[PDB]
Amino acid sequence: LIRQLLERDKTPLAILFMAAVVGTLVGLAAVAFDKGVAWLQNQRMGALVHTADNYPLLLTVAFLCSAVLAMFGYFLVRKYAPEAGGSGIPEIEGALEDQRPVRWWRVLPVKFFGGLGTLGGGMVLGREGPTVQIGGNIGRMVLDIFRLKGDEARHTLLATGAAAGLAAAFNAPLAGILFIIEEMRPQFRYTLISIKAVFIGVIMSTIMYRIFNHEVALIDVGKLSDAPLNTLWLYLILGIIFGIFGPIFNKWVLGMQDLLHRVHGGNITKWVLMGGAIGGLCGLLGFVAPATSGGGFNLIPIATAGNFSMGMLVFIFVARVITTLLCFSSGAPGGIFAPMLALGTVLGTAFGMVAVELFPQYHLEAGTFAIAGMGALLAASIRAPLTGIILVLEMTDNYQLILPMIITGLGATLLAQFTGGKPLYSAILARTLAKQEAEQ
Amino acid sequence: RQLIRQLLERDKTPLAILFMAAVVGTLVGLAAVAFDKGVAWLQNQRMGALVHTADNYPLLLTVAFLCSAVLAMFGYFLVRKYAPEAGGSGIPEIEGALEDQRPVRWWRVLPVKFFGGLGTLGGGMVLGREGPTVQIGGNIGRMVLDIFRLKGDEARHTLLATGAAAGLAAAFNAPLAGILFIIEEMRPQFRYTLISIKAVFIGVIMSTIMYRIFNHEVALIDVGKLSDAPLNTLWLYLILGIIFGIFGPIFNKWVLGMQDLLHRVHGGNITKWVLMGGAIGGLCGLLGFVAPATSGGGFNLIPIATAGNFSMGMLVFIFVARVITTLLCFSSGAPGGIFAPMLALGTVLGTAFGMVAVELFPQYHLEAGTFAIAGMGALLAASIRAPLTGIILVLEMTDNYQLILPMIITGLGATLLAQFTGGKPLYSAILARTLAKQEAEQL
């Protein structure tokens, strides 16, 4: 009696089956990207050990290999795909609506190969941007394979691919679910089946991630002490000092974009030569000191343990802000999410040392502010606290301090609105839509 | 200075909303702490009285029957008079008040939900403390807004939201599930304004602070670290998801039939209603001493059934004689929620399916107790259709965050087979029936 009624409910089960195949296709193409970025990074620095007789020659070999990888990425991006260069999240936030197209023809080779080129070279970016853009474009690709002309299936499978990309870029299933409901809330349908397709995508993508990697947390810090009471106002003070800083590192990106848009003009023969020099200089800076340059997913346990002085922390913070403004605002095919975690961990440790020095009788531990700083800086700069305070907990497993994290996320997202500020993934989207409308 | 004075009075209208959200958070923190201390004192006093007068067995049976029936009649007569809307699940009468449907009364709801809702729950009925305090928060948000007469349109649907969120957060010690409840479950009712979503955060943290002041932070359920679920038994949670998805609309149709089946035993008058409900509360207080895991508050068995073990026949007896008493003690019209009895109904079927799976599948290295954590958030997601709240709510109070993937697996299965098989959310169907009654009593 079920088989005759199954045809009456056929077309939602079609969307569920496409969500189940998206959760395999991305989640395989995410683990392939992660293994590709693990390759030719340790292989790149292992190609450096048999040439230690001439140290400037070693410097120039590191500079040239990072520069040719960045030039490969920028040449593969600035040809065949002007929509690939950037953080990826606005270019599908405008594609959940009918404002920006998802052209999977020439992005899914381009974003993957350019992300390998700009991430194995050692630039500051961190892969969730390419992983979510690849996920959304796979969610658009598989709807072209099995021909479906529904005007809601393409809005459902894009959100399913985005959720299943973010749930494999971070091993964060719950944050992969809530990223759609928080960051892409005005670009969503929620018609009682587009939460189920998102669930199937997140489940299958996390299964295909954990079937290859065996790690309980992407950032391996142990069980820190739980934050007691009568010391959560220090987390509120950290929230205030991040809410002041939030729009400052939201105006700086949009200023550095307009600054670096004129150093090359519009032709790719200057953009490639500028971005290759930027990526090579960042690779040399990563060889010289592997704390100022490099991706965001190093240095977070090293800082949250407390293995840094105050002057080293402020030098790492200044040079890290400079290099994450230089290596992302040039139209790079990488993400700005993980460098925000690096900046948050650095300033959280720099505040935790101060809070331990000033108040000894609170019995503090300077790692807890380093944990809360990422979930506050994401809330201050992208204006999405609910999918930040779980994205920094799904890969840390420090669930005991879950209340000061909400306190500092609230304190960041309040003073990010008291000061005139906007979400970065909406400011970039509105700016490129205004640029496209001014062009056409 | 003059520049910060000019910027201060320009934004005086959202800042007043945030300050009232802080006041609502502190008030529901004090109210829920007083509610938990009241029901704890009532349960401890009743058990101490029965232990003191436990000399002869028929006398001990009769005094334990008269207790939690005198309190039940005091919790029913004070509801059926002065407050015809209080005696329900608490939450749907403010889900129909996030809109403009139901009136948000604080005149005769707070001294009803904090007198009868204390008296019929501290006596030891099946219903949990989740239901009263969310309505207490949503009805004290209007009291906070009406003590200073702000009278804004965006203010009322913000202080009806932060009261519910902070009431849930002070109920189950869950500062994520409080926000996620009225982000996900209240999606057809709550309006995003980018200031209300800050006011809800303010209310949730300022109520969780006033809860963690009085109750020391360990857990609500005493299961520390169960075994993790590897990537070989993840399909086995999906079968329990299918089972709970079938049980989804099979449950809360018994509620739908019982709410109109117990309407014939008393009609509509107060005297036969309170005399039926006194016998119901006395039967439940008797079953809370004859076999003190079949009935009660619903939290006295979850560290027992999750960590330790019952027998299989004992577990199916607990499940059957718990289904037969949850409907009997809730659907009469009592002040109490179906979060905690739903969790108690989920953990027993989870432990029973775990004891089935550890015997029929020996070659999985299965710990049988870890399926009950999935079963709680599976029956909750199947009968309320709020999976994203139901995962994080049981994860806030069991602290087994090492298994978050089988939780989403069984929530997916439960929601999918509760949507394919024709079912409705219970907290929306109760609201639809009460709205139909309100529109039909006039015409």
Automatic annotation (TrEMBL), chain B:
<feature type="site" description="Mediates proton transfer from the protein to the inner aqueous phase">
    <location>
        <position position="185"/>
    </location>
</feature>
<keyword id="KW-0868">Chloride</keyword>
<dbReference type="GO" id="GO:0015297">
    <property type="term" value="F:antiporter activity"/>
</dbReference>
<dbReference type="GO" id="GO:0005886">
    <property type="term" value="C:plasma membrane"/>
</dbReference>
<feature type="transmembrane region" description="Helical">
    <location>
        <begin position="15"/>
        <end position="35"/>
    </location>
</feature>
<feature type="transmembrane region" description="Helical">
    <location>
        <begin position="273"/>
        <end position="290"/>
    </location>
</feature>
<feature type="transmembrane region" description="Helical">
    <location>
        <begin position="370"/>
        <end position="395"/>
    </location>
</feature>
<feature type="transmembrane region" description="Helical">
    <location>
        <begin position="337"/>
        <end position="358"/>
    </location>
</feature>
<feature type="transmembrane region" description="Helical">
    <location>
        <begin position="195"/>
        <end position="214"/>
    </location>
</feature>
<comment type="similarity">
    <text>Belongs to the chloride channel (TC 2.A.49) family. ClcA subfamily.</text>
</comment>
<keyword id="KW-0997">Cell inner membrane</keyword>
<feature type="binding site">
    <location>
        <position position="339"/>
    </location>
    <ligand>
        <name>chloride</name>
    </ligand>
</feature>
<keyword id="KW-0813">Transport</keyword>
<protein>
    <recommendedName>
        <fullName>H(+)/Cl(-) exchange transporter ClcA</fullName>
    </recommendedName>
</protein>
<feature type="transmembrane region" description="Helical">
    <location>
        <begin position="56"/>
        <end position="79"/>
    </location>
</feature>
<keyword id="KW-0050">Antiport</keyword>
<dbReference type="GO" id="GO:0005247">
    <property type="term" value="F:voltage-gated chloride channel activity"/>
</dbReference>
<dbReference type="InterPro" id="IPR014743">
    <property type="entry name" value="Cl-channel_core"/>
</dbReference>
<keyword id="KW-0472">Membrane</keyword>
<feature type="binding site">
    <location>
        <position position="427"/>
    </location>
    <ligand>
        <name>chloride</name>
    </ligand>
</feature>
<feature type="binding site">
    <location>
        <position position="89"/>
    </location>
    <ligand>
        <name>chloride</name>
    </ligand>
</feature>
<comment type="function">
    <text>Proton-coupled chloride transporter. Functions as antiport system and exchanges two chloride ions for 1 proton. Probably acts as an electrical shunt for an outwardly-directed proton pump that is linked to amino acid decarboxylation, as part of the extreme acid resistance (XAR) response.</text>
</comment>
<feature type="transmembrane region" description="Helical">
    <location>
        <begin position="310"/>
        <end position="330"/>
    </location>
</feature>
<keyword id="KW-0812">Transmembrane</keyword>
<feature type="binding site">
    <location>
        <position position="338"/>
    </location>
    <ligand>
        <name>chloride</name>
    </ligand>
</feature>
<dbReference type="InterPro" id="IPR001807">
    <property type="entry name" value="ClC"/>
</dbReference>
<feature type="transmembrane region" description="Helical">
    <location>
        <begin position="234"/>
        <end position="252"/>
    </location>
</feature>
<keyword id="KW-1003">Cell membrane</keyword>
<keyword id="KW-0406">Ion transport</keyword>
<dbReference type="Pfam" id="PF00654">
    <property type="entry name" value="Voltage_CLC"/>
</dbReference>
<feature type="transmembrane region" description="Helical">
    <location>
        <begin position="402"/>
        <end position="421"/>
    </location>
</feature>
<feature type="site" description="Mediates proton transfer from the outer aqueous phase to the interior of the protein; involved in linking H(+) and Cl(-) transport">
    <location>
        <position position="130"/>
    </location>
</feature>
<comment type="subunit">
    <text>Homodimer.</text>
</comment>
<dbReference type="InterPro" id="IPR023861">
    <property type="entry name" value="Cl-channel_ClcA"/>
</dbReference>
<feature type="transmembrane region" description="Helical">
    <location>
        <begin position="159"/>
        <end position="183"/>
    </location>
</feature>
<keyword id="KW-1133">Transmembrane helix</keyword>
